[PDB]
Each structure stands twice: as C-alpha cells, then as structure tokens.
Amino acid sequence: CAFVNQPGQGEALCGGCTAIALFNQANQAPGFGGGFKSGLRGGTPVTTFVRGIDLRSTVLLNVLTLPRLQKQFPNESHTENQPTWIKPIKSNESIPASSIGFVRGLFWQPAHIELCDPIGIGKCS
RNA sequence: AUAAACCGACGGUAUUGUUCAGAUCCUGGCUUGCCAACAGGAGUUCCCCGCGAGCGGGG
C-alpha cells in the first residue's frame, strides 16, 4: 500500500466523508485487529441491497415493513434500542447476547474511538 | 507522462545400485541370344622465307 498507492488521502475529512468512514469501518471492514473487534455479522461481511432507479426509491426498497421487521427481532422485552453511543457496550466479557435489539444492533459500532477535534474550511481529502 | 510512475521471486540440491536374449532351420528344380556387314568415303592446310607444274626449309 505504502508502495503502490497515492499519498495524502487522509489529511482532512468531513461530516459525510467521515461518518461514512466510521460506519463502514464498524460493519464492512475488519480493522484493526489486535484486541479490537468487528461486529456483528463478522469481519469482511458482504452486503446485498435491492436497487432502484433513484437513491430515494433504493433506500426505501431495502426498508423492512413493520411486520417483516417484527418477525425477526420481535422479542423486544429484553430490548435495547439504544446505540453504543446513547447507551454504552456493557464493558467486558458480556454475554449477554441475543438481546441486542432492533436498533442497538444495526448501529452497533464497537470501535470504541473518540473522533478528534474538527478543523478548517478546505477540501475533503 | 495512462489504477500510472519508481519496480529481480529470490537463494541451496548425484536419481542412485544389481542384469546372456536365449536354443532349432537347403531357397530349391527348368532355359541360346541366334540371323546380315570391304572402316568404306574423300587431295583447301592459315603465315613467313628460298629454287623453279611444283619442290624444299621454317612456325
């Protein structure tokens, strides 16, 4: 990578270009090893999305109807519908599992990282 | 001056040792190469000399 790739893609990042980085890192990438974790599907998980003629149609076409939604994660009673950031990961060795819930699972980001202070008016790298 | 540019897939290695291809076997029997023949035939032979139809001496 250091040999074959262009430098300076990481100088400066933005609201979008960063948020996307964070989500992508949490779900679709396996970094960084060494006592970090990747969740929940695993590492290198693959996505499958139905596509439409327009982003609008597309984003909806992959939304889950309330009952189809209800069938998969209904149990609810042991719900947590609170993101890692709203309510934190319960520290170490837990276990509990299977009670992740409708929301807290999809936005499950276990990177456990504090994004540095924002800066500047200039181009996104 | 192009997912380009700058850019080794690199180094070390016996395929080795033992081994008759052997013993037996007629290619045998029958045929013609015969008939005719003066080695005929024809003096051009190119140049110099000497003595006269020709004769010598020279290349």
Please list, in sequence order, all residues whose beta carbon lies within 8 angstroms of the beta carbon of residue A47, skipping any fewer than 6 positions away: A28
Nucleotides of B under 7 A from a protein CB: 4-6
| Residue A4 contacts strand B, CB under 7 A | yes
Nucleotide nearest to A5 (CA to C1'): B3
Method: X-ray
Distance A4 CA to B53 C1' (A): 123
| Residue A117 identity | D
Q: Which residue is the nearest neighbor of B4, CA to C1'?
A: A4
Q: How is residue A36 annotated by DSSP?
A: -
Give the C-alpha separation, A103 to A78, whole Å.
13
Q: Which two tokens stand for residue A80?
A: 């947590």
Token pair 């994660």 in the structure block, residue: A73
Q: Which two tokens stand for residue A30?
A: 């396996």
Gaps in chain A (C to N over 2.5 angstroms) fall after none
Rg (CA), chain A: 18
Distance A35 CA to B13 C1' (A): 44
Contacts 24+ apart (CB under 8 A), A109-118: A109/A22, A109/A23, A109/A25, A109/A26, A109/A27, A109/A83, A109/A84, A109/A85, A110/A26, A110/A36, A110/A37, A110/A38, A110/A39, A110/A84, A111/A22, A111/A25, A111/A26, A111/A36, A112/A36, A115/A18, A115/A22
Nucleotide nearest to A4 (CA to C1'): B3
